Amino acid sequence: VQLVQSGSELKKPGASVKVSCKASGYTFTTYVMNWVRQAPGQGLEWMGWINTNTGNPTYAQGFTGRFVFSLDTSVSTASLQISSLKAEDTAVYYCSCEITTLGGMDVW
Amino acid sequence: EIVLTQSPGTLSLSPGERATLSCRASQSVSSSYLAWYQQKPGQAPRLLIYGASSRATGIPDRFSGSGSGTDFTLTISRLEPEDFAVYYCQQYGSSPTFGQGTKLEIK
Amino acid sequence: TNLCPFGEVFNATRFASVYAWNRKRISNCVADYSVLYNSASFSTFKCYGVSPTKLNDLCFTNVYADSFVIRGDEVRQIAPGQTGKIADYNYKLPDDFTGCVIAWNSNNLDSKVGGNYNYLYRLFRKSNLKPFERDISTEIYQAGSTPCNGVEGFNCYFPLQSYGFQPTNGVGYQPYRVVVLSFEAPATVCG
Amino acid sequence: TNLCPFGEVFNATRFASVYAWNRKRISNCVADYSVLYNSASFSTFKCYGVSPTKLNDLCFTNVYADSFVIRGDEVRQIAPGQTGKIADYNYKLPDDFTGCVIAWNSNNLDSKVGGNYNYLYRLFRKSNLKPFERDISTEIYQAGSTPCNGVEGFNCYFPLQSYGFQPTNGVGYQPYRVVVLSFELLHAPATVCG
Numbered sequence A: 001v002q003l004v005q006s007g008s009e010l011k012k013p014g015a016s017v018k019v020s021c022k023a024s025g026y027t028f029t030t031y032v033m034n035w036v037r038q039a040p041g042q043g044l045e046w047m048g049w050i051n052t053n054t055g056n057p058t059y060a061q062g063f064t065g066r067f068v069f070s071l072d073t074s075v076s077t078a079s080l081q082i083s084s085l086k087a088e089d090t091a092v093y094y095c096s097c098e099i100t101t102l103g104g105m106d107v108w
Numbered sequence B: 001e002i003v004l005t006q007s008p009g010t011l012s013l014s015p016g017e018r019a020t021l022s023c024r025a026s027q028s029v030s031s032s033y034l035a036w037y038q039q040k041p042g043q044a045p046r047l048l049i050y051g052a053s054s055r056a057t058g059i060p061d062r063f064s065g066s067g068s069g070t071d072f073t074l075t076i077s078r079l080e081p082e083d084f085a086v087y088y089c090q091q092y093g094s095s096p097t098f099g100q101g102t103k104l105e106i107k
Numbered sequence C: 001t002n003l004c005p006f007g008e009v010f011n012a013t014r015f016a017s018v019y020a021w022n023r024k025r026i027s028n029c030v031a032d033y034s035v036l037y038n039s040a041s042f043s044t045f046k047c048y049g050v051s052p053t054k055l056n057d058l059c060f061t062n063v064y065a066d067s068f069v070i071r072g073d074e075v076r077q078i079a080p081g082q083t084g085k086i087a088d089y090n091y092k093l094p095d096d097f098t099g100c101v102i103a104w105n106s107n108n109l110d111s112k113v114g115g116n117y118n119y120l121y122r123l124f125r126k127s128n129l130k131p132f133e134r135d136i137s138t139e140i141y142q143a144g145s146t147p148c149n150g151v152e153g154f155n156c157y158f159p160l161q162s163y164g165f166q167p168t169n170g171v172g173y174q175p176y177r178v179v180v181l182s183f184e185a186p187a188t189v190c191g
Numbered sequence D: 001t002n003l004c005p006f007g008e009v010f011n012a013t014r015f016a017s018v019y020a021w022n023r024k025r026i027s028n029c030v031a032d033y034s035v036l037y038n039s040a041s042f043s044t045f046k047c048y049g050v051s052p053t054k055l056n057d058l059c060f061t062n063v064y065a066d067s068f069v070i071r072g073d074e075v076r077q078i079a080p081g082q083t084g085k086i087a088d089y090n091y092k093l094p095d096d097f098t099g100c101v102i103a104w105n106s107n108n109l110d111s112k113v114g115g116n117y118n119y120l121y122r123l124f125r126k127s128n129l130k131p132f133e134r135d136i137s138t139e140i141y142q143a144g145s146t147p148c149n150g151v152e153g154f155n156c157y158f159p160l161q162s163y164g165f166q167p168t169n170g171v172g173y174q175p176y177r178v179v180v181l182s183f184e185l186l187h188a189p190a191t192v193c194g
């Protein structure tokens, strides 16, 4: 099992950005992919998750209206798109797996 | 238990023609445990299809499986001389059970 | 004198595969068992070593709530002294088991039309599991003398398969949500 | 619309030996199963293939109330797919059993101070019992190549032994009254409901 994300992104405010999250080793539509945000000097902050079978995304409060989880099952690739970038959205963004509610957040 | 009913008991066709062997299960059954085997006169059986539609390695394209639920069919697209043998089907719950066998001979 | 969070285990929206089974620890709370028992929505509710209607008047130092999803034909294996792929290679109860097992049909919640391959079971292992053992190992299983080194092929298979749960499956082949309550110093779980 | 005689089985003054178990045949009556399980008088009330609370809302063609006496240690064996001397040589439940097993301690009723040897089990038999087989044959068990001809001695023993129930026995060595309710099916018409 492996997760490899895309490269760093510099953008102006109001721009947009799309991060990718390739996987390898297992069956991509078997498990859930969720996203976590770590701003400078803050803790981890859970953003949400997308069902890899049905496509149904779930956004925790605060990441609604400008963030889009998406998938491309042709390349086992998760993506994170942010519209209308603000200065405060500056952070590290992690994609991560969920074996189960138990094995939740095992691979990063 | 699971009980398997092959039809017909004896299927007669000439070389070239297409063979449709039937296997019938006494109750609803998972397509993930159903295999087909070939037995030439005096030889140990050969695994042909496993799961429900997957060719075991070494088995040519002319063989092809199908089915779900309670009816499943082995299909030999174009018969060849070495395909005239008896064919059995397997299902499996707590333990394996087989079918009665279909003899395939020259018409 | 807080209540026990059973509703968080049973009524949980999603469960875990049987090979990576869940274990919730219950302590410092009160529990009404016959309310779960009078619920009459379960297909199996069988205890061992004690009675379901006498449960309310008892205490234990700790109670463990184990939950997973198996297949209708395999519920019979979640019992002491049982054999099979689930009993041997996924979840085993000790012969001196003194708890309860609970299950109900969950075809409505856990089966997708194309196929819900989210739930998995262990199929290939070299020896049975100890009582209450948990094996999450995904090492390639070696059936031949030649070793595998994380490469599938002949004599080298993935030790895990997926349940194929479709709504049109046979009842025995449908998914059943299972919960196990183990019973076990001063006591903190009473009624 | 008559009520079932479950009281006649459960509340019966004297029970049977386990090798010679009873089959009261229940037919043509209404059964309130929920009256039985909320009794909370049983140390074992473990069904299989059906839910105790959902039982009231059901019907069957024939209900078979099997009842016998064993020790508490052996109560575990009154289950599908068990081994042991009771499960193998006295009373065997099928691996497709679909009924209930009910048990309660009977040391007050079924134990005498000097020792009550009325109850018995089968200790020697050449092969396991078929499901729901009753074996009442008292034939001298042959252990050697030399036949017995109804004369005890070496390699020739009485097939039956006696439970030794004393009020001072260990709780597992104490008597437990068992009632086994076996449920059939439809196709044929039903006679027992709730």
Ligand SMILES: *[C@@H]1O[C@H](CO)[C@@H](O)[C@H](O)[C@H]1NC(C)=O
Binding pocket: C006, C007, C010, C011, C036
């Ligand atoms: C699950 O939810 C239903 C509906 O609210 C409720 O009736 C039931 O008691 C709940 N189960 C548990 C174990 O709390």
Ligand SMILES: *[C@@H]1O[C@H](CO)[C@@H](O)[C@H](O)[C@H]1NC(C)=O
Binding pocket: D006, D007, D008, D010, D011
């Ligand atoms: C046995 O007798 C007691 C005392 O009358 C009664 O409460 C109980 O219900 C009876 N049991 C059955 C199975 O009828």
